[PDB]
Design a protein around this ligand. Structure first.
Ligand SMILES: O=C(O)c1cc2sccc2[nH]1
Ligand SMILES: O=C(O)c1cc2sccc2[nH]1
Ligand code: NA
Ligand code: NA
Lengths: 168, 168
């Protein structure tokens, strides 16, 4: 079932989400399923549960839009926790299904570890770098009430997608 | 003649505009006329020349949309210069025809003087306060390559117009 993606300005994107406590359940598998399918219909590369107004520490991401980017595995991750593996920052283009039509260059950690659980309950623990890492940090921000504009350093790079010609 | 309003991301909104040097001319009266009419068709309260891709220190503003706001006189102002008359800041909702659908709360000086010229060449010099002042500061920012997002302090207040329920 495709869910409506709520848009920036909705207070429900600004909340700190509680943990998932129904790992391995049918209610969670169905919700995850709705997320992949919502993500897929909107052509997303990641989608966090608060963007479909579900107050939970859950995100889906991955794909084989962002045309220059390498493959990221299709992943559903509950209770994500993130640690930087280096202090190196890297600038890159982000957009967001809750902020349609726009994008900006955003600094993120180049190198992270993230941990949490698959919907079935098995542990997930990975080192990620570059675009993979950026996606996870971006979706993690939603789980703590944060959107990408408040991370923009260079406002010359923020603009509509069809108009932007800033050269990174 | 209504002109296309160019959208955030166009590099032409990011330039420092040179002065108008054709005060009292027919070329300027016609351009001003195009601005009022462009402003009017888009339901603006102010429009700066760089938003129709004209690289000049010129803006029009005023009206008898922003439904709670008091009347501001219809004004065409060339070579605007602005001085704060007090250090008092005041927060208020802004939007922008180059950033359609969005708005944010933005701090501005409560009390300003602005000077420059009418299109006919006569001097204009006024003290302005509140909404009047905010409009002029906002349009002045365009003339130096600046848009309102880079002035947002509280990102919880930035969002789409039809969705926002932040209570100022
Ligand atoms: O969640 C999203 O919509 C999103 C995350 C990232 S990272 C680069 C683009 C992009 N879009
Ligand atoms: O130039 C504009 O579109 C504009 C200036 C201001 S001040 C409050 C709204 C608003 N809109
Ligand atoms: Na918040
Ligand atoms: Na600029």
């Amino acid at each position: 079932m495709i869910r409506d993606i709520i848009r920036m300005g909705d207070k429900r994107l600004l909340r700190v989400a509680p943990q998932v406590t129904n790992l391995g359940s049918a209610e969670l598998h169905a919700l995850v399923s709705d997320m992949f399918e919502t993500m897929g219909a909107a052509h997303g590369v990641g989608l966090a549960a608060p963007q479909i107004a579900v107050d939970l520490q859950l995100m889906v991401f991955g794909f084989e839009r962002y045309p220059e980017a390498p493959a990221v595995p299709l992943t559903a991750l509950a209770n994500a926790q993130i640690e930087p593996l280096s202090d190196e920052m890297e600038n890159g283009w982000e957009g967001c299904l809750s902020i349609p039509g726009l994008r900006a260059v955003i600094p993120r950690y180049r190198y992270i570890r993230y941990r949490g659980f698959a919907p079935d309950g098995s542990p997930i623990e990975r080192e990620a770098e570059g675009f993979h890492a950026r996606v996870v940090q971006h979706e993690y921000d939603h789980l703590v009430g944060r959107l990408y504009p408040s991370r923009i350093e260079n406002f010359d790079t923020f603009g509509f997608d069809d108009v932007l010609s800033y050269d990174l």
